[PDB]
Structures are given as structure tokens and as C-alpha cells.
Amino acid sequence: MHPVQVIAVTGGKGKTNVSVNLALALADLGRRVMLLDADLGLANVDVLLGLTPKRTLADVIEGRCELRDVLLLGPGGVRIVPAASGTQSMVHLSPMQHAGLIQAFSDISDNLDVLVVDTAAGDSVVSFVRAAQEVLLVVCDEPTSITDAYALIKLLNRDHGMTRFRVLANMAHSPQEGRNLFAKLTKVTDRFLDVALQYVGVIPYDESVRKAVQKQRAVYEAFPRSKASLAFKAVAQKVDSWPLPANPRGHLEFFVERLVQH
């Protein structure tokens, strides 16, 4: 009935993992979800630490294994596809690699409602962000957060034709502080760009987040009725209200199409 929704989340990992908690909150609303792990920065350090997964999405694209062979289970049982080890350009794929890409995302799409793409790199990441239906920019009260958010909008706008962005204030100590953050970004993008920002809201500063982090758990899973978790539920409600991709339900063909061109 509905096409698969695809959301890219940029920023927001104060240890506060927005993609994982959004995925859990969406599942709690009855959506079938999956995470795509596209944090290049993290992957690069992990290589030196021997932390690279044995198999990744790149291996599926190369036809070495199937999608089900690379799935990991994260907090609350959310399924994760490792996707930050690609050394190949999504626009210089061979027919064999293209077929592997189609296969990977066909398999990802099976019985799926929402794919959440987690990213942290200004590439072989950006492909996933540009191809996503919605981009969720996570911003906080740290000094460089707003300018980092801006620099990313500038890049996606100028280099990848992207013109609309969702903005979430993470761990804001008050609604006013979240509003100020959005007001600043709006004023700056107003002057230099022609883009449309939309303010999703605030994940409130919450001691439960640290408490969950120290237990190596996601706050939504550990403490589903803490203030931050209730805010993630509300975000998840907003997210299921964003427009779906403009095509009938298929097997994520639209996303693969965007990855390889445009």
C-alpha cells in the first residue's frame, strides 16, 4: 500500500543516539523499521580497532553474500545494515554491482515501512543522504552545532540539489532554547540560500539519557516514559506524517535509482 519511507539522520549521537531512538519509537507505533549505518567517521576509526563488521552492504553489492548475512541486531532488536565501508562510487557501478545493489535494497524493503539512515560524514555516505526522502538535521547547544548544521545544508544544497530539511533540537534545556536554535538557522539560511527548513521540535535534556547510556541501552528502550523518550514518540508521530515517496509501493527501486544518478 505505502511505499517505504526513507529518513536520513545527520548529527546527534552528550551521548544521544537519535537514529536508534527514532527507530525504536517508530516500531512502538507499529511501524516495521530498519537502520542503515552510514557513519563514515566512526567506520574509519573502527578499521584501526579491528571493529569493522565481517560483512557489510559493500559485500552484498559485490555479490559475496546476501543482505540477511550482514544484518546486525542493535538496541531493542532493531536491525542494522553496516554501510560505511564502500570504496566504490555509486555512480561508477558495474552491471554486476548494480544488480547487487538492487538485490540488497529489494531485500531491505521486504515487509518494511521505514528505513532510517544514520550518517556522520560531510564520501560514500552522502549518497544515502541525498537519496533519502527526508533529511533530519540534529542540532544542539554546543558552540559549533549551528554552524556545522549550516555548512551541511550549504553543501547538500549547492552540491546535491537538496532544498528541504527537517531540524531537531537535541537535549535542549527549554523549548525557548530549541526555538532560538531554529530561529538562528532560519535567519542564516534565509540570507544565503533558497531552502525550506521545518522545525520538528525538541528532545528535552533528560538525565535518563545518561543513565541509559551508562547501561549501554537506548533511552527509548530503557526508559520509555522518561521525558526524552516521550519526545521521541512524538517525533515518531510527526515522522509518519511526512509525505511518502511519490511512487506506488515497490522494492525501494526509487532509492536505488537516486543512489546511482541524479
What does the DSSP assignment read for 56-94?
Answer: -HHHHHTTSS-GGGT-EE-GGG-EEEE-----S-TTS--
Domain of 5 in residue numbering reads as 1-262
Q: Is 205 annotated for ligand binding? A: yes
> What total number of domains does the chain contain?
1
| C-beta atoms surrounding 215 within 10 Å | 12
CA distance linking residue 121 with residue 24, whole number of Å = 23
Q: Is 150 annotated for ligand binding? A: no
Contacts of residue 116, defined as CB under 8 A and 6 or more positions apart, other chains included, come to: 7, 9, 19, 22, 23, 26, 33, 34, 35, 36
CA distance linking residue 248 with residue 246, whole number of Å = 7
Q: Is 204 annotated for ligand binding? A: yes
Q: Is 62 annotated for ligand binding? A: no
Asked how this structure was determined, the answer is: X-ray
Strand order in the sheet with 79-82: 72-73, 79-82, 33-38, 114-119, 5-10, 134-139, 164-172, 196-204
